[PDB]
Scaffold this active site. Sequence first.
Site, PDB file in Angstrom:
ATOM      1  N   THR E   1      13.679  41.210  -2.757  1.00  0.00           N
ATOM      2  CA  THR E   1      15.106  41.273  -2.788  1.00  0.00           C
ATOM      3  C   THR E   1      15.604  40.037  -3.700  1.00  0.00           C
ATOM      4  O   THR E   1      14.891  38.986  -3.760  1.00  0.00           O
ATOM      5  CB  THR E   1      15.669  40.977  -1.233  1.00  0.00           C
ATOM      6  OG1 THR E   1      15.458  42.024  -0.453  1.00  0.00           O
ATOM      7  CG2 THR E   1      17.385  41.216  -1.296  1.00  0.00           C
ATOM      8  N   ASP E  17      20.457  43.112  -5.025  1.00  0.00           N
ATOM      9  CA  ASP E  17      19.961  44.608  -5.233  1.00  0.00           C
ATOM     10  C   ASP E  17      19.517  45.327  -3.759  1.00  0.00           C
ATOM     11  O   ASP E  17      19.822  44.801  -2.781  1.00  0.00           O
ATOM     12  CB  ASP E  17      18.714  44.447  -6.124  1.00  0.00           C
ATOM     13  CG  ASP E  17      17.417  43.956  -5.310  1.00  0.00           C
ATOM     14  OD1 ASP E  17      16.855  44.621  -4.486  1.00  0.00           O
ATOM     15  OD2 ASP E  17      17.315  42.817  -5.420  1.00  0.00           O
ATOM     16  N   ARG E  19      16.658  47.641  -3.237  1.00  0.00           N
ATOM     17  CA  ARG E  19      15.273  47.870  -2.804  1.00  0.00           C
ATOM     18  C   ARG E  19      14.839  47.126  -1.662  1.00  0.00           C
ATOM     19  O   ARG E  19      15.058  45.987  -1.344  1.00  0.00           O
ATOM     20  CB  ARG E  19      14.238  47.730  -3.929  1.00  0.00           C
ATOM     21  CG  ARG E  19      12.828  47.721  -3.665  1.00  0.00           C
ATOM     22  CD  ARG E  19      11.902  47.623  -4.915  1.00  0.00           C
ATOM     23  NE  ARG E  19      12.385  48.709  -6.003  1.00  0.00           N
ATOM     24  CZ  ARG E  19      11.740  48.597  -6.860  1.00  0.00           C
ATOM     25  NH1 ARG E  19      10.794  48.001  -7.092  1.00  0.00           N
ATOM     26  NH2 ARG E  19      12.049  50.009  -7.529  1.00  0.00           N
ATOM     27  N   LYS E  33      21.975  44.934   1.483  1.00  0.00           N
ATOM     28  CA  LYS E  33      21.548  43.555   1.933  1.00  0.00           C
ATOM     29  C   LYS E  33      22.984  42.861   2.111  1.00  0.00           C
ATOM     30  O   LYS E  33      22.733  41.401   2.205  1.00  0.00           O
ATOM     31  CB  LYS E  33      20.792  42.946   0.996  1.00  0.00           C
ATOM     32  CG  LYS E  33      19.744  43.790   0.275  1.00  0.00           C
ATOM     33  CD  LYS E  33      18.425  43.726   1.176  1.00  0.00           C
ATOM     34  CE  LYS E  33      17.404  44.515   0.594  1.00  0.00           C
ATOM     35  NZ  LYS E  33      16.245  44.677   1.606  1.00  0.00           N
ATOM     36  N   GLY E  47      14.441  37.767   3.356  1.00  0.00           N
ATOM     37  CA  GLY E  47      13.188  37.546   3.808  1.00  0.00           C
ATOM     38  C   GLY E  47      13.120  38.757   4.853  1.00  0.00           C
ATOM     39  O   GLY E  47      13.491  39.904   4.739  1.00  0.00           O
ATOM     40  N   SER E 129      13.339  36.915  -3.522  1.00  0.00           N
ATOM     41  CA  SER E 129      11.904  36.991  -4.165  1.00  0.00           C
ATOM     42  C   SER E 129      11.999  36.853  -5.783  1.00  0.00           C
ATOM     43  O   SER E 129      11.322  36.125  -6.308  1.00  0.00           O
ATOM     44  CB  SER E 129      11.196  38.351  -3.704  1.00  0.00           C
ATOM     45  OG  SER E 129      11.460  38.870  -2.524  1.00  0.00           O
ATOM     46  N   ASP E 166      10.899  41.196 -11.409  1.00  0.00           N
ATOM     47  CA  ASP E 166      10.382  41.031 -10.142  1.00  0.00           C
ATOM     48  C   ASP E 166       9.859  42.479  -9.653  1.00  0.00           C
ATOM     49  O   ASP E 166      10.499  43.449 -10.079  1.00  0.00           O
ATOM     50  CB  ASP E 166      11.366  40.653  -9.078  1.00  0.00           C
ATOM     51  CG  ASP E 166      10.712  40.353  -7.948  1.00  0.00           C
ATOM     52  OD1 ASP E 166      10.330  39.102  -7.519  1.00  0.00           O
ATOM     53  OD2 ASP E 166      10.639  41.137  -6.780  1.00  0.00           O
ATOM     54  N   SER E 169      12.095  43.926  -6.305  1.00  0.00           N
ATOM     55  CA  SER E 169      13.813  44.336  -6.674  1.00  0.00           C
ATOM     56  C   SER E 169      13.905  45.612  -7.736  1.00  0.00           C
ATOM     57  O   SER E 169      13.034  45.720  -8.420  1.00  0.00           O
ATOM     58  CB  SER E 169      14.361  42.990  -7.152  1.00  0.00           C
ATOM     59  OG  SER E 169      14.465  41.941  -6.438  1.00  0.00           O
TER      60      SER E 169
END
Lengths: 244, 242, 234, 233, 220, 204, 250
Positions: E1, E17, E19, E33, E47, E129, E166, E169
């Site tokens: 994320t 995002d 995913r 999120k 997390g 991330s 990433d 994401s």
Amino acid sequence: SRGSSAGFDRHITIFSPEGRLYQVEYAFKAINQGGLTSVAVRGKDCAVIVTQKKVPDKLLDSSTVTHLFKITENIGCVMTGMTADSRSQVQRARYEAANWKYKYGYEIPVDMLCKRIADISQVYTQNAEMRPLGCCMILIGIDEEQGPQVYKCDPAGYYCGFKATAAGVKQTESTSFLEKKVKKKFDWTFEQTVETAITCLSTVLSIDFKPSEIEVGVVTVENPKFRILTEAEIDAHLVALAER
Amino acid sequence: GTGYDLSASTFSPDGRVFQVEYAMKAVENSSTAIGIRCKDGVVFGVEKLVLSKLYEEGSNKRLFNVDRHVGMAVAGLLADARSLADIAREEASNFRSNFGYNIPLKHLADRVAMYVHAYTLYSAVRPFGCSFMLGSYSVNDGAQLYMIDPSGVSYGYWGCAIGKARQAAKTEIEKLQMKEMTCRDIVKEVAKIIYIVHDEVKDKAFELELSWVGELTNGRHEIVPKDIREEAEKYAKESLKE
Amino acid sequence: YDRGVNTFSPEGRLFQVEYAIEAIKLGSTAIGIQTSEGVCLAVEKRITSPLMEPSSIEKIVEIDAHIGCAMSGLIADAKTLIDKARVETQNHWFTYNETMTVESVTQAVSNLALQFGEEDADPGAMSRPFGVALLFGGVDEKGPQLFHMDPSGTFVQCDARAIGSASEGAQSSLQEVYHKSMTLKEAIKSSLIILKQVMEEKLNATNIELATVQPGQNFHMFTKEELEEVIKDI
Amino acid sequence: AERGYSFSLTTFSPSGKLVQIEYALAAVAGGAPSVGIKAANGVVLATEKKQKSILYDERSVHKVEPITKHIGLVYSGMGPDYRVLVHRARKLAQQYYLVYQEPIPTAQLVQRVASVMQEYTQSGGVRPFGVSLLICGWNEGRPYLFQSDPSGAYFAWKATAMGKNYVNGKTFLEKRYNEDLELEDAIHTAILTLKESFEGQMTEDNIEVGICNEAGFRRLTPTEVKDYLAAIA
Amino acid sequence: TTIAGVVYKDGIVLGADTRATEGMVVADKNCSKIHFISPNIYCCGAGTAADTDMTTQLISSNLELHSLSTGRLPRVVTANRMLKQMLFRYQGYIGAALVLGGVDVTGPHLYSIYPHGSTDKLPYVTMGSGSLAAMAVFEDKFRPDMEEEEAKNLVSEAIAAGIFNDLGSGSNIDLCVISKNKLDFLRPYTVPNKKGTRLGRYRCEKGTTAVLTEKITPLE
Amino acid sequence: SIMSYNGGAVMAMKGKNCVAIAADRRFGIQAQMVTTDFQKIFPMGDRLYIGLAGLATDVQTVAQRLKFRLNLYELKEGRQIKPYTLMSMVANLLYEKRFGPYYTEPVIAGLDPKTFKPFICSLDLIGCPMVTDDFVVSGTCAEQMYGMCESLWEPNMDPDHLFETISQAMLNAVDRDAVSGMGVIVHIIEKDKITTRTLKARMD
Amino acid sequence: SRRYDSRTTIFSPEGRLYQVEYAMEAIGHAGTCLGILANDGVLLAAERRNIHKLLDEVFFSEKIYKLNEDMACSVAGITSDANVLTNELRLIAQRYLLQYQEPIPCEQLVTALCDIKQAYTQFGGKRPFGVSLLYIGWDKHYGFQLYQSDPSGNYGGWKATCIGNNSAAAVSMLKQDYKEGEMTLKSALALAIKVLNKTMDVSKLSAEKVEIATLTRENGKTVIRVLKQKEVEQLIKKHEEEEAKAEREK
């Protein structure tokens, strides 16, 4: 029914056949025990307290009898009645209003502070192991979302917010005098509110005070710190009642 | 009363709590103790009655150390006095751990009133039959003298008395000035008051217990040396004849 | 008004304990004589019908292999003290590996005997005092001993004691028959003679219980033919 | 300090009453009158809010507390004991919303509050709450109105009063209530049936009115109530 | 994320995002999120997805309660002080990583709360991330007290850069605009890449998987 | 982990007015199979199934402790359970035991009783709501089933054509896994009727 | 304190429990509630204590709580305490299911409740629960069963019985009319209406004065329906003809 005893209803806090609680009706007659009276008048830019200071002796130090307590930096009060209960409930007030700031991060409203102080008091009304505290607090303070505020909780637990109030023995003489001067609607500046408070206590006792017989706690919108006026500043407002 | 005095948990139809007022009488049946705050310390005077030749003189005290720089003088049921003195000792040791200095007397007064008050709200307990006075000197706050009664009320005092002759001795303290004398001058006037208000026609004898706590001893609380006690009793027998 | 279970009378003594003492004056009669050759405990197994099984109502128990006990009063309370003593002499033997002296077991059940708490106490504490009197009579290292124990939680060593509903008439009759030279065989007959006066039933080989404790033997309760053997002489 | 009393103070009498809950009801019936009208479209809760002077403030306290975003209370009885139940209800609501991720239905929130009131007629040393609640709410496509008694029972109404002169109000409603009333028109019926018991002139400060339609519970602002008293909208 | 927040002059823009990755396998190609706390305070969770849900939901229920009683809207300070003292009590096993940001009657604020109970009041934050991928976009193209529309295009720009650089994401970019008069919470906002089309037809029609038994239960 | 310890596989796949949920049936202790019939799908009121794959012990406790919290909610309130709630009730029963988790991943597959809108969601073993509209899987053949569904799914299917797809995508997914297989069962819920067909498969 | 205490867990000088005796009076003047057993089912009828025309009647039933998927019960007494025991029954019965994985036998369910009524009478110094209940159920060890519990902590089985006001007059009526070992679910309904005319003030009843809920077995599962107002009306309208034919004896 109608004013009838039935069992242990005049000793502990259970209901009576007509519907009242006599252990609470009784706690109010303990406010008039203290033989003190306190007025608190609200203004358009400040809120005020004025109290009787009575030192029976000259041995008794005059500065550690007071009834104005700083609850926090922005919340003053004035305790009326059974003095032991006073300090006990101010201890608990300070504690919550400081606990509040710890769990939410900002100074407590004066509104809520009293809510929570009344909510602790109600618990005594509903359990039979203790009597209600025999005292009556008045809180003042300046909120930033609605101006100056005055609250006043009871031994039963019914804090409502006011424009001007009194507590203690002469409670009925004060509300008479005050409400006539709330219908005219002045400009209620800082000076005109300190004036209304003193002259409302003066005529209900018929004294005309020296600066040593009253103590005035005041809180303003220019300076939200709860101040206690010194005997020099109280006397400037008293010689201005003589001129008018 | 009928049910208006069995419990501490019952207001009277007046507004009074007879169980707290009844505890007040246990103080009226106990000998006198007076406290006089000068401008550089405090002096405690206790009219301890000697009731037999079977008791060791200088014992059965009524002057305690609540802390090394605080006196307590009691009047009332001694059993509760020795109960209060341990709650204070405990409180003032507690305070020195968490805050790291000596506990200011104004504060200790409030904590011990709190604890006395909590015993006037419940059925499980009776109020304390004990009034007492706290006395302490510092060099950063001055001399201070508070007095707590069964109700749980504390006040500041310049001079205070408790016990069976509280009326008579409060008058004799008001004639005395105190805001200008040192300890060395007051201690004689304390002894003098005690002799005037005591009855040797109601009591066999009495022993006069005196306490510093002031600039003399360096803020510590201590009894008065045997020498200055003999002088203060000798000066009181002469002013009593006159 | 009503007073809890912890209240002194203006006299000076606790109400509840004063009454536990009257609860014995309804009970059976037990006469223990203590000699130089052993302690003998005799009691009356008060039956009430012939249907009742006389052999299952005993009021002498073995506390250990050297400490008999004969109780009179409310036998139902007794089963709580007795059990606590057996546990007591055993615990003691588990730690020190010796027998408990008869004095010390009397002392441990007397602590238990006064401690009840209307309020401010455990949930398993006792609400009232025990309605029993006991006669521990063991033999140990001070020779034979006998102890009397009353519901006040106090114990005084004895030489010859009667408890129960006929304590006064038996106690006077003990003072005239008991001397320090008495042997264990003379003592057993002295018991049943005085017991035979105060029983308003009759002496019979099922209406008494007889048990001794002797320096050379364990606690031994008399069977039914050894009771018949000492009723011939009476 | 006391551990508490354990023995109950509510207790049967030889006739079969729970004398304490009998008296609690008489405290209720002494309180400030209040009426409820379910309008097959919405619910209206109105109650009088009279003060003893001009000194009080009216924006300090209210008698229409919201519990969720579609459940309101009003009461008559003891203002202290009312502020306790309001607070407990909000924790129940939230506790419920924490576990099922829905907002508490109103049928549910009446049983849960009822039980708390019930519990104080069978615990130690306590007295019953001197209150009765009106718990409106708009769940599942309908409206709801309930009423919790100091006893600990409840009843689902289509109209009712309580407090002062509830025998007069209950018969005024039994006559002047017609199913399929409009929501607006119920408000006229509410303030109307509150006008019989009431004494003195009505103003926007004397009555608290609170609606409850599929848009959610709310108070009516002092302005809206001034146009219902007149009747000029 | 990737989570991001910016403060502009009227309010806040929270972006993230969508995913959610369980292993190195995408579990949900659409997963908000951005959790609602109060009407004026959103919070974004990175997390362990299960630890943020049950932390924000619990706080939401102490803020909804808290506001009814004071009877005014609740401050951002308050939610910040509840999350901090709850997480600290578990000394880090609660793996929530929060970008809390609301608009009060004392201005917009924006906190970031790391699992462990640490707070960092800032003017623009990134958790997640590809949080670093985002923090770079912010170091060039952030200027204080920007326009409402310059911000909307900044935060989508940082989440886009966290998506491409990433693996944790990808997919949609959620934006939330908190201002002191509106609340434009728009779940799709950008869709960088979509799935392509099946080039042929791989389905099949009845009569192709063998059955052993079957039985019908009719209801009403 | 200790949820490959019994295998298991569950797949739920949303149609157009209908929802299908399929599992395999092989209950085994690592390699050694004990029996070939062992239910991993439970009814939770009609037109609402919850499937549980993973460690067989927490399968049965979660299914038994969920029937005990659902039955007590379906009586104390009269309303039958709504699938979006049943998800959050399960998220909360796993998270109740955050530290020392359960080793199961629920797969909830129902129709709303008040309407008929189909609904599927899985959950991580600690309690996370993962609502999609394509198809959810949990188990040990996770990767394999994702492959098969991502290429056979289509946005709208009739209830006869849905059953072909879930079948195709469950037989080929479970065949490429060691610790699963031994026949799959398939509920396919429609508005009127619940069909339950068992597919002939590898008894490998 | 002991001064304010009302000892409620203490014997009388005659060997009775006063608080349990008075609890009977709270049930004596409560709403009527009878249940009659059959072979093809078993049913609870009960007077609707509250009636009006402002009540909303949006309940399953005012008196009938469903305890399980196999058992119901109707209460009579202090409605406050009913809401407690009917929710503590549901908890016992689902707790037996979590542990034995099968429905709870009807006898056991009730005793496990009446270990809770029993406790409140023997220690705690609380007042006892002022409610009595009937239970209808079906298990696999006995078929249909009816049981009745007292606020004493005491239960009994029954093949027909009655609590709440005029219970005496009801049980006398039932004891003539009940045929032992033979009785269909259609005769028990016509017997129930016949006993409610005799107990009730309004001698014609309404469909709004009663609530009748049968519990039958239909296809292995148990079914517990509360009869609509149309079904119940046809039992009252058909009982006016049984009295139009009973007036002819000449």
